[PDB]
Amino acid sequence: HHWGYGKHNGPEHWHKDFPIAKGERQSPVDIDTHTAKYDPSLKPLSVSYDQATSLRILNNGHAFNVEFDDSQDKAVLKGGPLDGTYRLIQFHFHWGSLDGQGSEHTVDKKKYAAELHLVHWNTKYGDFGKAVQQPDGLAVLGIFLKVGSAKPGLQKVVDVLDSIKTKGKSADFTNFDPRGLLPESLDYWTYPGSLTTPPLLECVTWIVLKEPISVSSEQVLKFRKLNFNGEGEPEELMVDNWRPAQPLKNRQIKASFK
Numbered sequence: 175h176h177w178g179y180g181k182h183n184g185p186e187h188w189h190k191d192f193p194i195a196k197g198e199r200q201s202p203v204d205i206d207t208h209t210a211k212y213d214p215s216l217k218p219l220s221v222s223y224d225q226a227t228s229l230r231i232l233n234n235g236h237a238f239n240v241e242f243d244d245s246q247d248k249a250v251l252k253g254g255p256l257d258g259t260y261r262l263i264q265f266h267f268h269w270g271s272l273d274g275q276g277s278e279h280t281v282d283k284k285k286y287a288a289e290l291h292l293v294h295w296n297t298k299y300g301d302f303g304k305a306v307q308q309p310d311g312l313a314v315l316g317i318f319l320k321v322g323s324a325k326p327g328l329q330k331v332v333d334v335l336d337s338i339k340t341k342g343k344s345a346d347f348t349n350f351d352p353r354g355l356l357p358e359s360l361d362y363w364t365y366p367g368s369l370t371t372p373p374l375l376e377c378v379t380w381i382v383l384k385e386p387i388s389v390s391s392e393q394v395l396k397f398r399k400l401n402f403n404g405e406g407e408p409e410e411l412m413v414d415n416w417r418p419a420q421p422l423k424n425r426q427i428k429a430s431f432k
C-alpha cells in the first residue's frame with residue numbers, strides 16, 4: 175500500500191485499497207455544536223497518566239509517533255463514554271501547511287492548525303492488534319491546537335524533530351509527560367468512529383476535547399520541517415497530513431457539558 179496525502183495517493187484515493195473508507199462510521203467528522211446534545215448519562219472522564227512511560231519517537235512517513243510502554247496499565251483512559259480500561263500506546267499529530275488548516279475534526283466547519291491524537295486500546299482484548307478488530311477496541315482522545323502562545327510541555331517534542339526528519343528515523347524519547355499536552359478543561363464531544371488513516375477500521379470511540387491548546391508559530395513551523403520522504407530521497411515536506419471530514423450518517427455526537 176502506497177497511501178499518503180498527495181494529489182495522487184491522498185484521501186480521495188484511499189477507498190480503492192480500503193473500501194471501508196466509504197463506510198458507516200468513518201472519521202473525522204464535523205462537530206456541529208448546535209446539533210450535539212448534552213448527555214447527562216456520561217460518567218466523569220478519567221485521564222490517569224501519572225505512571226506513563228514514553229519510549230521512543232518515530233517518523234513513519236505519515237506523522238511522528240511518540241510511543242509508550244503499554245505492557246501494563248501505566249497510562250490509561252477511563253470513564254466518560256468508556257466501559258473499562260483503555261491503555262495509552264502512542265500519540266501523534268496532524269497539521270497543516272498554513273495555520274488555518276491541519277485538524278481532522280472541525281467545529282462548526284472551523285479547521286484548527288493541528289490536532290493531537292492520544293491513542294488507547296481496550297485492555298479486555300489483550301493486545302492492540304486484537305483491539306482494532308472490535309467496535310469498541312480503541313479510544314482516541316483528540317485535542318485541537320491553535321497558534322498563539324507557546325506550549326511549554328510541547329517543546330521537548332519540537333526539539334527532537336531535527337533528529338527524525340525523514341521516514342523511518344526514530345530516537346529515544348524517555349520520560350516525556352503527556353499531561354503537559356492537555357488543556358485545562360476536559361469538556362468533550364464523543365461519537366463512534368474510525369481510524370483516520372488506512373486501514374480506516376471502524377473501531378474507535380472518539381473523545382474530542384472542546385478546549386484547544388495554544389502552541390507558538392515557531393513550534394508548529396518546526397512540525398512543518400519534517401519530511402514524508404526517506405533519507406536521500408527528494409524532499410517532500412510533511413504538511414497537510416489530515417483527512418477531511420467524512421459523512422456523519424446515522425450517528426449522534428454527544429456533549430459532556432451543558
Ligand SMILES: COc1ccc(C[C@H]2SC(=O)NC2=O)c(OC)c1
Pocket residue numbers: 237266291293306314368369370371372373
Ligand atoms: C492499525 O491500527 C492503527 C491505529 C491507529 C493508527 C493511527 C491513525 S488513527 C488516528 O486517529 N489517527 C491516525 O493517524 C493507525 O495508523 C496506521 C493504525
Ligand SMILES: [Zn+2]
Pocket residue numbers: 266267268291370
Ligand atoms: Zn491521528
